[PDB]
């Protein structure tokens, strides 16, 4: 079936909260107003509608560094003190898969990733794995 | 013969399921199509090739050719008697006049009315001798497979014979299909297979309809 759609208005700081292709989660006021173009298109007193936005989240970016709390940072930095943190992270990738420890290790290294750099300001090399 | 692959697939769907499904532009529906397909297929080249069987000449899939109840060959013999009779018939067509036209239109009118009436009121149903004759026909044409260990028939042939017998009973307005109809169905069906499924090296063989490349062709490998 064809999908339905709605227009939404972002104001002030909510602009640039999303881009095309973003699976957003939008809170807003469902607002309606008279529209003569829709009236002549439908032949009835049909009112256009738009969502006056009040919050935009994303359903893939469920966590972000701009939302991390001091307690989250504290427990993260406490976990890093453990000498088993590498093994814990490797065991934590796809825990419902038995074995494949080398695969989990490689995927952890790719998931965290290296550091991009540009020595001399003239020669780029990627950081991603 | 020269319908494109999408048309071949949708026609296969229509002939097998008697429906046409469409999911085009938000519309999602399954239209009914209980249509009787009557077809005219040319050889791929300009002439018929007696070195090859129907499926290899016309280049249609067996998935479509096995859905047909009857397949007929319309090529003319090379006999001078046939040519002379055809020429006399065509001369008679040239000399067709008002009396022949009125006779033909009378035949056409009564034929249309007869077919419509038979559709409207006749509903054939199986007699015991019809059931025995159909089972006997299928078992007999399967008994040919004792030679060479081959398959010589398949149950959709039996269903085709049921359709043809019911049609013949409807022609004579019997309302009960019996052995006269079943023997005519067997005769016409066997003649259709003789025309269509004849490998040039060995004659009629049923596997030509089931798959392309009969045994005389496939035994190259």
Swiss-Prot record, chain A:
Disulfide cross-links: none
Top-level division of the source organism's lineage: Eukaryota
Protein location: Nucleus; Chromosome
UniProt PTM comment: Phosphorylation by the CDC7-DBF4 complex during G1/S phase is required for the initiation of DNA replication.
Modified residues (Phosphoserine): 96
Function: Acts as a component of the MCM2-7 complex (MCM complex) which is the replicative helicase essential for 'once per cell cycle' DNA replication initiation and elongation in eukaryotic cells. Core component of CDC45-MCM-GINS (CMG) helicase, the molecular machine that unwinds template DNA during replication, and around which the replisome is built.
Connected disease: Deafness, autosomal dominant, 70: A form of non-syndromic sensorineural hearing loss. Sensorineural deafness results from damage to the neural receptors of the inner ear, the nerve pathways to the brain, or the area of the brain that receives sound information. DFNA70 is characterized by slowly progressive, postlingual hearing impairment.
Protein family according to the UniProt entry: Belongs to the MCM family.
Subunit and interaction comment: Component of the MCM2-7 complex. The complex forms a toroidal hexameric ring with the proposed subunit order MCM2-MCM6-MCM4-MCM7-MCM3-MCM5. Component of the CMG helicase complex, a hexameric ring of related MCM2-7 subunits stabilized by CDC45 and the tetrameric GINS complex. Interacts with DBF4. Interacts with KAT7. May interact with MCM10. Component of the replisome complex composed of at least DONSON, MCM2, MCM7, PCNA and TICRR. Forms a co-chaperone complex with DNAJC9 and histone H3.3-H4 heterodimers.
Comment field (misc): Early fractionation of eukaryotic MCM proteins yielded a variety of dimeric, trimeric and tetrameric complexes with unclear biological significance. Specifically a MCM467 subcomplex is shown to have in vitro helicase activity which is inhibited by the MCM2 subunit. The MCM2-7 hexamer is the proposed physiological active complex.
Protein name per the record: DNA replication licensing factor MCM2
Organism of provenance: Homo sapiens (Human)
Lineage, uppermost ranks: Eukaryota, Metazoa, Chordata, Craniata, Vertebrata
GN (gene name): MCM2
Residue numbers of the full-length protein present here: 389 to 517 of 904
Swiss-Prot record, chain B:
Motif (Arginine finger): 66-69
Residues binding ATP 1, per UniProt: 67, 156, 159
Signal sequence bounds: none
Binding site for ATP 2: 42
Subcellular location: Nucleus; Chromosome
PTM characteristics: Sumoylated; SUMO2 modified in response to stress caused by inhibition of proteasome activity (in vitro).
Chain's role: Acts as a component of the MCM2-7 complex (MCM complex) which is the replicative helicase essential for 'once per cell cycle' DNA replication initiation and elongation in eukaryotic cells. Core component of CDC45-MCM-GINS (CMG) helicase, the molecular machine that unwinds template DNA during replication, and around which the replisome is built.
Disease in which the protein is involved: Immunodeficiency 54: An autosomal recessive disorder characterized by severe intra- and extrauterine growth retardation, microcephaly, decreased numbers of natural killer cells, and recurrent viral infections, most often affecting the respiratory tract and leading to respiratory failure. Affected individuals also have adrenal insufficiency requiring corticosteroid replacement therapy and may have an increased susceptibility to cancer.
Subunit structure: Component of the MCM2-7 complex. The complex forms a toroidal hexameric ring with the proposed subunit order MCM2-MCM6-MCM4-MCM7-MCM3-MCM5. Component of the CMG helicase complex, a hexameric ring of related MCM2-7 subunits stabilized by CDC45 and the tetrameric GINS complex. Interacts with MCMBP.
General remark: Early fractionation of eukaryotic MCM proteins yielded a variety of dimeric, trimeric and tetrameric complexes with unclear biological significance. Specifically a MCM467 subcomplex is shown to have in vitro helicase activity which is inhibited by the MCM2 subunit. The MCM2-7 hexamer is the proposed physiological active complex.
Family: Belongs to the MCM family.
Protein name: DNA replication licensing factor MCM4
Lineage summary: Eukaryota, Metazoa, Chordata, Craniata, Vertebrata
Shown part of the complete sequence: 577 to 797 of 863
């Amino acid at each position: 079936r064809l999908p339905r759609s709605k227009d939404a208005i972002l104001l002030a700081d909510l602009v640039d909260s999303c881009k095309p292709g973003d699976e957003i989660e939008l809170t807003g006021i469902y607002h309606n107003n008279y529209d003569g173009s829709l009236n002549t298109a439908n032949g009835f007193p049909v009112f256009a509608t738009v969502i006056l936005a009040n919050h935009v989240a994303k359903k893939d970016n469920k966590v972000a560094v701009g939302e991390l709390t001091d307690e989250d940072v504290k427990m993260i930095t406490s976990l890093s003190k453990d000498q088993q943190i590498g093994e814990k992270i490797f065991a934590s990738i796809a825990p419902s898969i038995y074995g494949h420890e080398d695969i989990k290790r490689g995927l952890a290294l790719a998931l965290f990733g290296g550091e991009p750099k540009n020595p001399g300001g003239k020669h780029k090399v990627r950081g991603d794995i | 013969d020269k319908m494109n692959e999408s048309t071949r697939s949708v026609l296969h769907e229509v002939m097998e399921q008697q429906t046409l499904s469409i999911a085009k532009a938000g519309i999602i529906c399954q239209l009914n199509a209980r249509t009787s397909v009557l077809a005219a297929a040319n050889p791929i080249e300009s002439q018929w090739n007696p070195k090859k069987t129907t499926i290899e000449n016309i280049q249609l899939p067996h998935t479509l050719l096995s859905r047909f109840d009857l397949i007929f060959l319309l090529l003319d013999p090379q006999d001078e008697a046939y040519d002379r009779r055809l020429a006399h018939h065509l001369v008679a067509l040239y000399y067709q006049s008002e009396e022949q036209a009125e006779e033909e239109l009378l035949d056409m009118a009564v034929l249309k009315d007869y077919i419509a009436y038979a559709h409207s009121t006749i509903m054939p149903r199986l007699s015991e001798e019809a059931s025995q004759a159909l089972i006997e026909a299928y078992v007999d044409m399967r008994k040919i497979g004792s030679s060479r260990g081959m398959v010589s028939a398949y149950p959709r042939q039996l269903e085709s014979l049921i359709r043809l017998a019911e049609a013949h009973a409807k022609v004579r307005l019997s309302n009960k299909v019996e052995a006269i109809d079943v023997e005519e169905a067997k005769r016409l069906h066997r003649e259709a297979l003789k025309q269509s499924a004849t490998d040039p090296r060995t004659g009629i063989v049923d596997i030509s309809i089931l798959t392309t490349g009969m045994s005389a062709t496939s035994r190259k490998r």
